[PDB]
Design a binder for this molecule. Sequence first.
Ligand SMILES: Cc1ccnc(C2CCN(c3ncnc4[nH]ccc34)CC2)n1
Length: 164
Amino acid sequence: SFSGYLKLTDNVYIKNADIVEEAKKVKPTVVVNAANVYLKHGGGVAGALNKATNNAMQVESDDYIATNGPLKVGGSCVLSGHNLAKHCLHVVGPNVNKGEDIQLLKSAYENFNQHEVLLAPLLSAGIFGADPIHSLRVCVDTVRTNVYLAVFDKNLYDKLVSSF
Ligand SMILES: Cc1ccnc(C2CCN(c3ncnc4[nH]ccc34)CC2)n1
């Protein structure tokens, strides 16, 4: 199971870790990807997870988009987890650097409630431009299932914990 996490609430836990390395160690049922609507996994969490799959995630994703079209901001889809997890839940948080509505962050986190346990990043953090402290608050106030959050940056992790 998951190891070395700090308990934040009844159902939310946090660790200073690269989500990709955590997925390789744990091989969880569900790993969350910080996706965009096109499932173009270029950088951040998505680029890192895709690289770890040897680009198989991107090939699968391109076929999904060719069939279904883009996701919605706030939406998700379940695809394979490849070598990292049984499933990858690709969740689109709003990208504030693209002008997307930050109120869609709660909708994005609601997708987590469809899964009993998830390994996940903070949505809309990092290159998506939102305040990670706000993202953690929305996570705790929205997700009811068991969420193991991996935060790569140690200073941000320490700030998240000490201001919680
Ligand atoms: C202020 C600041 C500075 C540097 N990085 C960050 C973010 C980057 C995205 N991120 C991740 N957290 C967990 N596993 C991950 N794998 C790849 C990215 C990633 C959370 C922290 N924010």
